Design a protein around this ligand. Sequence first.
Ligand SMILES: Nc1nc2c(ncn2[C@@H]2O[C@@H]3COP(=O)(O)O[C@H]4[C@@H](O)[C@H](n5cnc6c(=O)[nH]c(N)nc65)O[C@@H]4COP(=O)(O)O[C@H]3[C@H]2O)c(=O)[nH]1
Ligand SMILES: Nc1nc2c(ncn2[C@@H]2O[C@@H]3COP(=O)(O)O[C@H]4[C@@H](O)[C@H](n5cnc6c(=O)[nH]c(N)nc65)O[C@@H]4COP(=O)(O)O[C@H]3[C@H]2O)c(=O)[nH]1
Ligand SMILES: Nc1nc2c(ncn2[C@@H]2O[C@@H]3COP(=O)(O)O[C@H]4[C@@H](O)[C@H](n5cnc6c(=O)[nH]c(N)nc65)O[C@@H]4COP(=O)(O)O[C@H]3[C@H]2O)c(=O)[nH]1
Length: 123
Amino acid sequence: AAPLEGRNVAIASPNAIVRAATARQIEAAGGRAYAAVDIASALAGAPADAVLLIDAALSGPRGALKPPAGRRSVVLLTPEQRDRIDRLKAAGFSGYLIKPLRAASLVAQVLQAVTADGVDDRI
Ligand SMILES: Nc1nc2c(ncn2[C@@H]2O[C@@H]3COP(=O)(O)O[C@H]4[C@@H](O)[C@H](n5cnc6c(=O)[nH]c(N)nc65)O[C@@H]4COP(=O)(O)O[C@H]3[C@H]2O)c(=O)[nH]1
Ligand SMILES: Nc1nc2c(ncn2[C@@H]2O[C@@H]3COP(=O)(O)O[C@H]4[C@@H](O)[C@H](n5cnc6c(=O)[nH]c(N)nc65)O[C@@H]4COP(=O)(O)O[C@H]3[C@H]2O)c(=O)[nH]1
Ligand SMILES: Nc1nc2c(ncn2[C@@H]2O[C@@H]3COP(=O)(O)O[C@H]4[C@@H](O)[C@H](n5cnc6c(=O)[nH]c(N)nc65)O[C@@H]4COP(=O)(O)O[C@H]3[C@H]2O)c(=O)[nH]1
């Protein structure tokens, strides 16, 4: 009953209620939660192996949202924002979760999370 035992998961969200609720879901599943207000603070505050849960609330006005290169990221969407799935997958997101999050769905997308593309002897 601890499917995230020994897993690190960051939650980047500008919303206090989403950061606290998602951190409580990560920890109840046996994971370690790293709460941050945005992508830069999630990269600075979370272990290098953490899966990044990134709130689509952090998108630009036209919906641009870049998952960090060489990291494993899942985007949090409203049901009305499902039209963005193809663009967010093309940007390098592993998958999506629909707000409000189901614990079982969070666990499955963290366990299956895949890397975005991207990341000397010559003196
Ligand atoms: N979340 C997610 N699923 C992916 C992804 N790629 C493929 N799938 C698969 O797509 C199925 C349909 O997902 P949906 O259309 O979002 O349809 C969903 C959605 O309406 C609802 N649902 C699932 N998870 C959540 C959740 O966390 N919150 C809320 N509010 N609804 C959820 O239940 C339906 C059935 O979900 P599943 O049985 O998991 O079945 C999912 C899942 O097995 C991905 O990136 N993310
Ligand atoms: N298999 C199953 N489990 C159920 C069902 N109803 C409740 N639960 C369980 O009860 C927990 C708490 O439910 P909640 O207070 O409604 O708290 C829920 C609720 O407010 C919301 N939520 C998730 N999916 C939906 C949905 O499809 N519709 C609505 N209206 N709210 C949802 O997200 C919260 C967290 O969801 P969970 O983490 O899944 O946590 C859920 C889940 O473990 C059900 O029909 N089937
Ligand atoms: N993880 C999760 N999944 C959710 C949640 N809300 C809805 N779902 C998903 O949506 C399906 C249909 O929910 P329903 O129409 O309320 O249909 C539900 C509902 O009528 C009832 N049910 C099951 N658990 C509860 C519960 O804790 N409270 C209430 N009041 N009804 C429940 O049994 C039906 C069948 O349940 P399921 O086979 O689980 O099928 C559920 C489940 O797969 C949620 O909060 N968390």
